[PDB]
Design a protein around this motif. Structure first.
Motif, PDB file in Angstrom:
ATOM      1  N   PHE B 179       0.827  -1.203   0.000  1.00  0.00           N
ATOM      2  CA  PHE B 179       0.000   0.000   0.000  1.00  0.00           C
ATOM      3  C   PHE B 179       0.864   1.256   0.000  1.00  0.00           C
ATOM      4  O   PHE B 179       0.581   2.213  -0.733  1.00  0.00           O
ATOM      5  CB  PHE B 179      -0.946  -0.010   1.203  1.00  0.00           C
ATOM      6  N   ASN B 180       1.924   1.272   0.812  1.00  0.00           N
ATOM      7  CA  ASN B 180       2.786   2.448   0.869  1.00  0.00           C
ATOM      8  C   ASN B 180       3.507   2.676  -0.455  1.00  0.00           C
ATOM      9  O   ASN B 180       3.590   3.812  -0.934  1.00  0.00           O
ATOM     10  CB  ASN B 180       3.785   2.310   2.014  1.00  0.00           C
ATOM     11  N   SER B 181       4.026   1.607  -1.066  1.00  0.00           N
ATOM     12  CA  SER B 181       4.676   1.742  -2.365  1.00  0.00           C
ATOM     13  C   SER B 181       3.684   2.191  -3.429  1.00  0.00           C
ATOM     14  O   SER B 181       4.018   3.004  -4.297  1.00  0.00           O
ATOM     15  CB  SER B 181       5.332   0.422  -2.762  1.00  0.00           C
ATOM     16  N   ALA B 182       2.454   1.674  -3.377  1.00  0.00           N
ATOM     17  CA  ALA B 182       1.430   2.109  -4.315  1.00  0.00           C
ATOM     18  C   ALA B 182       1.170   3.601  -4.177  1.00  0.00           C
ATOM     19  O   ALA B 182       1.240   4.345  -5.159  1.00  0.00           O
ATOM     20  CB  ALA B 182       0.143   1.317  -4.093  1.00  0.00           C
ATOM     21  N   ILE B 183       0.913   4.060  -2.950  1.00  0.00           N
ATOM     22  CA  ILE B 183       0.595   5.470  -2.746  1.00  0.00           C
ATOM     23  C   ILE B 183       1.787   6.345  -3.112  1.00  0.00           C
ATOM     24  O   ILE B 183       1.612   7.469  -3.596  1.00  0.00           O
ATOM     25  CB  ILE B 183       0.109   5.706  -1.303  1.00  0.00           C
ATOM     26  N   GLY B 184       3.013   5.845  -2.931  1.00  0.00           N
ATOM     27  CA  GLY B 184       4.167   6.550  -3.458  1.00  0.00           C
ATOM     28  C   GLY B 184       4.172   6.609  -4.972  1.00  0.00           C
ATOM     29  O   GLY B 184       4.624   7.594  -5.562  1.00  0.00           O
ATOM     30  N   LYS B 185       3.685   5.552  -5.625  1.00  0.00           N
ATOM     31  CA  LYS B 185       3.572   5.581  -7.079  1.00  0.00           C
ATOM     32  C   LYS B 185       2.540   6.608  -7.534  1.00  0.00           C
ATOM     33  O   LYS B 185       2.742   7.283  -8.546  1.00  0.00           O
ATOM     34  CB  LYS B 185       3.231   4.192  -7.620  1.00  0.00           C
ATOM     35  N   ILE B 186       1.423   6.732  -6.810  1.00  0.00           N
ATOM     36  CA  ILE B 186       0.500   7.838  -7.088  1.00  0.00           C
ATOM     37  C   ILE B 186       1.184   9.181  -6.866  1.00  0.00           C
ATOM     38  O   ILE B 186       0.994  10.119  -7.647  1.00  0.00           O
ATOM     39  CB  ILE B 186      -0.819   7.736  -6.288  1.00  0.00           C
ATOM     40  N   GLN B 187       1.973   9.305  -5.798  1.00  0.00           N
ATOM     41  CA  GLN B 187       2.755  10.523  -5.597  1.00  0.00           C
ATOM     42  C   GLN B 187       3.580  10.859  -6.833  1.00  0.00           C
ATOM     43  O   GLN B 187       3.529  11.983  -7.346  1.00  0.00           O
ATOM     44  CB  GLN B 187       3.673  10.359  -4.388  1.00  0.00           C
ATOM     45  N   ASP B 188       4.331   9.880  -7.335  1.00  0.00           N
ATOM     46  CA  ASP B 188       5.206  10.117  -8.480  1.00  0.00           C
ATOM     47  C   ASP B 188       4.403  10.404  -9.745  1.00  0.00           C
ATOM     48  O   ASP B 188       4.806  11.237 -10.567  1.00  0.00           O
ATOM     49  CB  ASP B 188       6.134   8.919  -8.681  1.00  0.00           C
ATOM     50  N   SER B 189       3.269   9.722  -9.921  1.00  0.00           N
ATOM     51  CA  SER B 189       2.426   9.958 -11.089  1.00  0.00           C
ATOM     52  C   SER B 189       1.877  11.378 -11.087  1.00  0.00           C
ATOM     53  O   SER B 189       1.973  12.092 -12.088  1.00  0.00           O
ATOM     54  CB  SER B 189       1.286   8.939 -11.128  1.00  0.00           C
ATOM     55  N   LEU B 190       1.308  11.810  -9.960  1.00  0.00           N
ATOM     56  CA  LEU B 190       0.827  13.184  -9.868  1.00  0.00           C
ATOM     57  C   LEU B 190       1.970  14.179 -10.014  1.00  0.00           C
ATOM     58  O   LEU B 190       1.766  15.287 -10.518  1.00  0.00           O
ATOM     59  CB  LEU B 190       0.090  13.410  -8.546  1.00  0.00           C
ATOM     60  N   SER B 191       3.177  13.802  -9.587  1.00  0.00           N
ATOM     61  CA  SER B 191       4.329  14.679  -9.771  1.00  0.00           C
ATOM     62  C   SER B 191       4.686  14.831 -11.246  1.00  0.00           C
ATOM     63  O   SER B 191       5.045  15.928 -11.692  1.00  0.00           O
ATOM     64  CB  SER B 191       5.522  14.144  -8.980  1.00  0.00           C
ATOM     65  N   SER B 192       4.592  13.750 -12.018  1.00  0.00           N
ATOM     66  CA  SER B 192       5.065  13.740 -13.398  1.00  0.00           C
ATOM     67  C   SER B 192       3.965  13.566 -14.435  1.00  0.00           C
ATOM     68  O   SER B 192       4.020  14.202 -15.490  1.00  0.00           O
ATOM     69  CB  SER B 192       6.109  12.633 -13.588  1.00  0.00           C
ATOM     70  N   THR B 193       2.963  12.730 -14.175  1.00  0.00           N
ATOM     71  CA  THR B 193       1.902  12.457 -15.139  1.00  0.00           C
ATOM     72  C   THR B 193       0.720  13.376 -14.855  1.00  0.00           C
ATOM     73  O   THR B 193       0.156  13.347 -13.756  1.00  0.00           O
ATOM     74  CB  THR B 193       1.466  10.992 -15.078  1.00  0.00           C
ATOM     75  N   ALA B 194       0.348  14.186 -15.845  1.00  0.00           N
ATOM     76  CA  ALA B 194      -0.729  15.153 -15.685  1.00  0.00           C
ATOM     77  C   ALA B 194      -2.103  14.593 -16.028  1.00  0.00           C
ATOM     78  O   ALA B 194      -3.107  15.272 -15.785  1.00  0.00           O
ATOM     79  CB  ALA B 194      -0.455  16.389 -16.548  1.00  0.00           C
ATOM     80  N   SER B 195      -2.179  13.385 -16.578  1.00  0.00           N
ATOM     81  CA  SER B 195      -3.448  12.797 -16.988  1.00  0.00           C
ATOM     82  C   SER B 195      -4.126  11.999 -15.882  1.00  0.00           C
ATOM     83  O   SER B 195      -5.216  11.463 -16.105  1.00  0.00           O
ATOM     84  CB  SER B 195      -3.242  11.903 -18.215  1.00  0.00           C
TER      85      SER B 195
END
Ligand SMILES: *[C@@H]1O[C@H](CO)[C@@H](O[C@@H]2O[C@H](CO)[C@@H](O)[C@H](O)[C@H]2NC(C)=O)[C@H](O)[C@H]1NC(C)=O
Ligand SMILES: *[C@@H]1O[C@H](CO)[C@@H](O[C@@H]2O[C@H](CO)[C@@H](O)[C@H](O)[C@H]2NC(C)=O)[C@H](O)[C@H]1NC(C)=O
Ligand SMILES: *[C@@H]1O[C@H](CO)[C@@H](O)[C@H](O)[C@H]1NC(C)=O
Ligand SMILES: *[C@@H]1O[C@H](CO)[C@@H](O)[C@H](O)[C@H]1NC(C)=O
Ligand SMILES: *[C@@H]1O[C@H](CO)[C@@H](O)[C@H](O)[C@H]1NC(C)=O
Ligand SMILES: *[C@@H]1O[C@H](CO)[C@@H](O)[C@H](O)[C@H]1NC(C)=O
Ligand SMILES: *[C@@H]1O[C@H](CO)[C@@H](O)[C@H](O)[C@H]1NC(C)=O
Ligand SMILES: *[C@@H]1O[C@H](CO)[C@@H](O)[C@H](O)[C@H]1NC(C)=O
Ligand SMILES: *[C@@H]1O[C@H](CO)[C@@H](O)[C@H](O)[C@H]1NC(C)=O
Lengths: 162, 314, 223, 256
Positions: B179-195
């Motif tokens: 769960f923590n790694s997933a939510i970090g992946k959302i962190q990185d996506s919102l940081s870099s992916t605008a869609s």
């Protein structure tokens, strides 16, 4: 050419650019060939004085409606006018985020909302009693004691019919 | 990370000043139409109150604003990304701050009413909802909140999707890390992916073009001599000035009626999405939704609302 | 065990229904404002017959009697364009309002299928709390439901633990977390305290003890 | 030194003969504003008062001393003058013109005057009691409304409401901007373009009427077209901040 007045809503005619608003000091730099500013919506925002190269904003005068916060005649008869989204300078008086509020005193205590005003402000007639306007507190601020190994399972209940 | 609009820009266009501002001829010509301008105002005020109603039906489903204890013995789950940080002056958590950073006046005729629930209050309701989800589980929406440990919440929350509760009690470490790694992946996506927030930039965008198109309707000729009421009054003799101002009033009132009609259609759309978000909190946050492919692909455990501008994020 | 009390609460809430109707003018706010919305929709539709709409007046007979037909035709042209635009606005507003009414009608059909003709599991769909049933009570241009729901009121703080190792084998509850009154440990569902003696019938073994977080040692009765 | 008292809810009349039942039909016309100053006059030791948009006249004549009026714009023996005589319970109206003296007045020491005429155009003859007579000229028609209510009080006006039904229509058609009464407490008011929210009962009698722009609750009632305003916040109207005077700027002087 007359005189120029700041921070007071007035008409203006700058080199043929007419309109209404209030001129305010601004820190936006202009290129020497650029005379007047603009916004995204093709709306004039900043105008430079031809006499002195000073950058002046242009701002709406007041706009906003005239709300009337009143309790029902069943309870009271007093009013409380809210002037929507205006500084309490052109128009007892308790300035709010939603606008300039008249007829109600700010209450340092926070209660349940009864007549929503705007931006978290709520009014009520009860505390003599008079119309007030405070910062809304949604329910009693609770802090359930989150536990390592403890639960609170109900022993009784109720069966309402909404 | 499901993205849902909930409310919208609570614009309440004042029709009288929108069309006729400091113009006696325009005022006297708009007085003939009568109920059109008043009905536009009534419809727009109905819209304005109805985004509020959406906002309480979505966030204000909690009786009392709860507060998470400063000690957080969650059994492995790291919630510091979404639980509010006291360090910031506004107690919006780190991911919510990322949302607001991702998403990027009111002086033509279109004075926007501020939301009754300001951004701090929205964040406080979301914090209360998420604190109820952690501490009280789901009963905080179906009666008074009930203290219950987060790991014992899985004693029923896996059972919701037909997965036995023992999965947590035998795999908690790796589930928490996942769960923590997933939510970090959302962190990185919102940081870099605008869609990722596509639907929220969608709603705020079409709001932006709605407002901008409406205000540039003021600059549209509409078949008149021009789009400057003051110039028309100054130049034209009244017999022709009245006719040209009539052309302007027809065109601009048609534009405003079209604007408010598209706004009513879009408000029904956002009401559909707002009832969708209310159902997904009630079933899905304040419980555990059984509707397949409703709270995202795959069997669903719980949801964590994260307030975003003019919307919500699950 | 408490059917009579259930009847007492049910009838008490029904009694409160009359008070809600009588003392409160906003108890039927939604239906009242829908009937209103329709009422002033038709009302303003009537008033646009009085609106000049840019014409000389709102009386076609007056226009024709006052001026010659070469200009009267143009006058009624403008007036009738205004009236047609007003009717188009009314019908579009009616279509959007009827779309809202259709959403509410499908919502009511869903609540009657899942909630009257069943027991809906969608939270906050048939009222605030664990829903029980509903009763449709028609009102003009609408319907009224009586969402009998279940709401816990009184709580008590107990101690929990996910598992129990009696002979070194873990024991997890099938439904309802483990609770204790202070001395002995019991099993009860989430929404009503009712203790059980912890036996193998309500527990299933899964894994060893050291893998479970929060497990406490406990004694299991042997039937 | 006229005294000024509160008018309460006085100055409401049936604007037109159309009959309405149980409806709160609002209207806007030349009306006496609520809670306005009233210029109380008395006969000690008789000027011309402005007609304005309308004229409100009330009197308390137990012995029927106040029975006459002289209206006009110039009174230069060239314009017709309203002249009302109430003698032997007969209402007499005539618009003849006669020469005026230095101090034209009627023989009233402690308990009439009329010479020959020049141009006459219109001829028509028909405490305990408070008689009200509003005077106005709309579309060239001079209108009088009357209402006699039996009360027992003389110090001031009662705190209540009563309508003013009309009696006659006078189609003089002549512009009027001044007037002057002829002679024991009587009041004078003034009509302004106000707006009310009338309330007709089951039988069509105005039981209560409220101004629009009196107070915020009055504006809320005027907008809602109702008397009972429930809880909540109501958007009544807008407000503008007017420009102070003007700002005009252009380049000047330049070099020489
Ligand atoms: C749950 O609460 C109800 C009241 O809401 C209790 O009902 C009471 O029962 C006692 C007898 O046990 C009666 O003497 C009271 O008159 C009842 N209350 C009322 C308001 O009539 C019920 O006993 C409670 N249940 C438990 C398990 O505590
Ligand atoms: C929960 O996660 C947060 C990260 O969002 C942790 O806070 C930071 O974690 C980084 C990772 O190494 C450290 O370098 C920082 O020193 C941490 N603190 C800050 C940035 O203030 C937090 O430690 C985690 N907590 C648990 C219990 O896992
Ligand atoms: C409204 O008026 C009734 C009439 O007596 C009264 O009983 C009721 O308490 C009033 N409403 C409130 C909220 O007080
Ligand atoms: C109102 O104006 C004053 C200056 O006159 C300013 O300091 C203040 O910030 C203004 N109020 C708001 C809410 O901006
Ligand atoms: C449980 O509740 C009782 C009564 O409020 C209180 O005295 C006791 O300290 C509580 N125990 C815990 C662990 O919160
Ligand atoms: C818990 O329940 C058991 C049931 O037999 C009883 O013996 C014991 O005294 C109870 N303890 C408390 C603290 O209520
Ligand atoms: C929580 O309870 C478990 C029970 O096994 C214990 O091991 C752990 O130390 C406790 N943690 C805290 C923070 O109380
Ligand atoms: C539970 O009991 C076992 C006996 O088999 C013992 O080894 C273990 O340490 C106990 N754990 C606790 C937390 O009491
Ligand atoms: C209307 O007149 C009738 C006469 O039969 C009377 O009974 C009724 O009370 C009157 N209405 C009102 C509101 O007084």
């Amino acid at each position: 050419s007359t005189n120029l007045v700041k921070n007071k809503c007035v008409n203006f005619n700058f080199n043929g650019l007419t309109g209404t608003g209030v001129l305010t000091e601004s820190n936006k730099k202009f290129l020497p060939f650029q005379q007047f500013g603009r916004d995204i919506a093709d709306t004039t925002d900043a105008v430079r004085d031809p006499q002195t190269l000073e950058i002046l904003d242009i701002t709406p005068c007041s706009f906003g409606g005239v709300s009337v916060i009143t309790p029902g005649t069943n309870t009271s008869n007093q009013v409380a006018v809210l002037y929507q989204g205006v500084n309490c300078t052109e128009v007892n008086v308790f300035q709010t985020r939603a606008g300039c509020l008249i007829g109600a005193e700010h209450v340092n205590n926070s209660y349940e909302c009864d007549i929503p005003i705007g931006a978290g402000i709520c009014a009520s007639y009860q505390t003599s009693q008079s119309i007030i306007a405070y910062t809304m507190s949604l329910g009693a601020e609770n802090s359930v004691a989150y536990s390592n190994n403890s639960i609170a399972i109900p022993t009784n209940f109720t069966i309402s019919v909404t | 990370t499901e993205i849902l609009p909930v409310s919208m820009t609570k614009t309440s266009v004042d029709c009288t000043m929108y069309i006729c501002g400091d113009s006696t001829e325009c005022s006297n010509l708009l007085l003939q139409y009568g109920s059109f301008c008043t009905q536009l105002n009534r419809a727009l005020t109905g819209i304005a109150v109805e985004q509020d109603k959406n906002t309480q039906e979505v966030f204000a489903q909690v009786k009392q604003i709860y507060k998470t204890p400063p000690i957080k013995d969650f059994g492995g789950f790291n919630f510091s990304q979404i639980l509010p940080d006291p360090s910031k002056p506004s107690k919006r958590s780190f991911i919510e701050d990322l949302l607001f950073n991702k998403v990027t006046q009111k002086f033509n005729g279109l004075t926007v009413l501020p939301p009754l629930l300001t951004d701090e209050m929205i964040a406080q309701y979301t914090s209360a909802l998420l604190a109820g989800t952690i501490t009280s589980g789901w009963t905080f929406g179906a009666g008074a909140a009930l203290q219950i440990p987060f790991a014992m919440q899985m004693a029923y929350r896996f059972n919701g999707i037909g997965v036995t509760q023992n999965v947590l009690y035998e795999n908690q470490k790796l589930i928490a890390n996942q769960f923590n790694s997933a939510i970090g992946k959302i962190q990185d996506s919102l940081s870099s992916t605008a869609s990722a927030l596509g639907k929220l930039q969608n709603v705020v965008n079409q709001n932006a073009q709605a407002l901008n198109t409406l205000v540039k309707q003021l600059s549209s000729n509409f078949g008149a001599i021009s789009s400057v009421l003051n110039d028309i009054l100054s130049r034209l003799d009244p017999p022709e000035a009245e006719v040209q101002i009539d052309r302007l009033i027809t065109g601009r009132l048609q534009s405003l009626q079209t604007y408010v009609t598209q706004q009513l259609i879009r408000a029904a759309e956002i009401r559909a999405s707002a009832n969708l978000a209310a159902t997904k909190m009630s079933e899905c946050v304040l419980g555990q939704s059984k509707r397949v492919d409703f709270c995202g692909k795959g069997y669903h455990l719980m949801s964590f609302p994260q307030s975003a501008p003019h919307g919500v994020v699950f | 065990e408490n059917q009579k009390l259930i009847a007492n609460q049910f009838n008490s809430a029904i009694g409160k229904i009359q008070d809600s109707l009588s003392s409160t003018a906003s108890a039927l706010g939604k239906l009242q404002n829908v009937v209103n919305q329709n009422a002033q929709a038709l009302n303003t539709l009537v008033k646009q017959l009085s609106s000049n709409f840019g014409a000389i007046s709102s009386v076609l007979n007056d226009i024709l009697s006052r001026l010659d037909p070469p200009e009267a035709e143009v006058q009624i042209d403008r007036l009738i364009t205004g009236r047609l635009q007003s009717l188009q606005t009314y019908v579009t507003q009616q279509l959007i309002r009827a779309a809202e009414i259709r959403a509410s009608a499908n919502l009511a059909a869903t609540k009657m299928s899942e909630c009257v003709l069943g027991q809906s599991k969608r939270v906050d769909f048939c009222g605030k709390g664990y829903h029980l049933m509903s009763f449709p009570q028609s009102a003009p241009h609408g319907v009224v439901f009586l969402h009998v729901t279940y709401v816990p009121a009184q709580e008590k703080n107990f101690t929990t633990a996910p598992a129990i190792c009696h002979d070194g084998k873990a024991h997890f509850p099938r439904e309802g977390v483990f609770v204790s009154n202070g001395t002995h440990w019991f099993v009860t569902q989430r929404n009503f305290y009712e203790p059980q003696i912890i036996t193998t019938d309500n527990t299933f073994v899964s894994g060893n003890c050291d893998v479970v977080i929060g497990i406490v040692n406990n004694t299991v009765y042997d039937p | 030194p006229p005294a000024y008292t509160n008018s309460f809810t006085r100055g409401v009349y049936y604007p037109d003969k159309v009959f309405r039942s149980s409806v709160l039909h609002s209207t806007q016309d030349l009306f006496l504003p609520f809670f306005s100053n009233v210029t109380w006059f008395h006969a000690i030791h008789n000027p011309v008062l402005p007609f304005n948009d309308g004229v409100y006249f009330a009197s308390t004549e137990k012995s029927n001393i106040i029975r006459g009026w002289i209206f006009g714009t110039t009174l230069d023996s060239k314009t017709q003058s309203l002249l009302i005589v109430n003698n032997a319970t007969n209402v007499v109206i005539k618009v003849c013109e006669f020469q005026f003296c230095n101090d034209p007045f009627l023989d009233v020491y402690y308990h009439g005057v009329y010479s020959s005429a020049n141009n006459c155009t219109f001829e028509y003859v028909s405490f305990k009691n408070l008689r009200e007579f509003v005077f106005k000229n709309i579309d060239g028609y001079f209108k009088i409304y009357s209402k006699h209510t039996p009360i027992n009080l003389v110090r001031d006006l009662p705190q209540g409401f009563s309508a003013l039904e009309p009696l006659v229509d006078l189609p003089i058609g002549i512009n009027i901007t001044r007037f002057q009464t002829l002679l024991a407490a009587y009041y004078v008011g003034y009509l302004q373009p106000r707006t009310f929210l009338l309330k007709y009962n089951e039988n069509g009698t105005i039981t209560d009427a409220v101004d629009c722009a009196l107070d915020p609750l009055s504006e809320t009632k005027c907008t809602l077209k109702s008397f009972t305003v429930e809880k909540g916040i109501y958007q009544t109207s807008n407000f503008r901040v007017q420009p102070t005077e003007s700002i005009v700027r252009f380049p000047n002087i330049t070099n020489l």
